């Protein structure tokens, strides 16, 4: 038996226990605190090498840590997305169903939103270019990536994903009588 929660489990939860000295009294820990002295902290500018501009923000950091490389810069790495020349498109990637500027818009969005195709679909310029389903965006992206890799791996199956979503939509839209029916079948077929 155990409990799971994110932020907290219930409104009646007891407060967290914070660490602190002197909880057993200051007098007993007097000699330890008096034996030492704190290291100096500074309000200092820091370079973030993940940023390309070079802007300097400020930190509370120890004096010896001044000028050290920003640790959060290690997180910075983007989702690998291929880049193609105008020539490579003209040679290989041409499709009568897709404009080049439309594909370039798709790939720019992909680089922006880390291949989160639901977000790409939301941000896709359906007004200027043709309306696209998320399966169409995935199809075009994975087709281009596979073709570029072959020119210079689980392949995408657009039909299977389309069928999967259509089935999920059909299962979602059904009336409460049509889910009462299914649960009554599921319980009576046992």
């Amino acid at each position: 038996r155990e409990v799971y929660a994110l932020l907290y489990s219930d409104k009646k939860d007891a407060p967290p226990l914070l660490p602190s000295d002197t909880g057993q009294g200051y007098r007993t820990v007097k000699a330890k605190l008096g034996s030492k002295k704190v290291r100096p902290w500074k309000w200092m500018p820091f370079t973030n090498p993940a940023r390309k501009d070079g802007a300097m923000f400020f930190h509370w950091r120890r004096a010896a840590e001044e000028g050290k490389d920003y640790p959060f810069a290690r997180f910075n790495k983007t989702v690998q997305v291929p880049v193609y020349s105008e020539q490579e498109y003209q040679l290989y990637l041409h499709d009568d169903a897709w404009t080049k500027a439309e594909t370039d818009h798709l790939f720019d969005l992909s680089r922006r939103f880390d291949l989160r195709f639901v977000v790409i679909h939301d941000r896709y310029d359906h007004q200027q270019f043709k309306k696209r389903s998320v399966e169409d965006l995935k199809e075009r992206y994975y087709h281009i990536c596979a073709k570029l890799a072959n020119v210079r791996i689980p392949v995408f199956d657009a039909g299977h994903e389309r069928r999967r979503k259509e089935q999920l939509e059909r299962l979602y839209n059904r009336t409460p009588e049509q889910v009462a029916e299914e649960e009554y079948l599921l319980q009576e077929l046992r």
Binding site: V79, Q80, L171, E182, L185
Partner: protein
Amino acid sequence: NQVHQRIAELRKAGLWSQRRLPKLQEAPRPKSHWDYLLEEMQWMATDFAQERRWKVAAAKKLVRTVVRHHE
């Protein structure tokens, strides 16, 4: 029986949820900067909620102790 035909007709229509299609695996990718940002965000939000709960409870404790000191 008739229930079997009903199930078969639902399955033909796709509406039989017991036989839902699987999901084709996306090509694998490592975590991006935004994924680490959302992880750190979730951790910081937890720390905020717990710190607020601690400050409220500690204030209540100290004030009721002062009231007992006067009583």
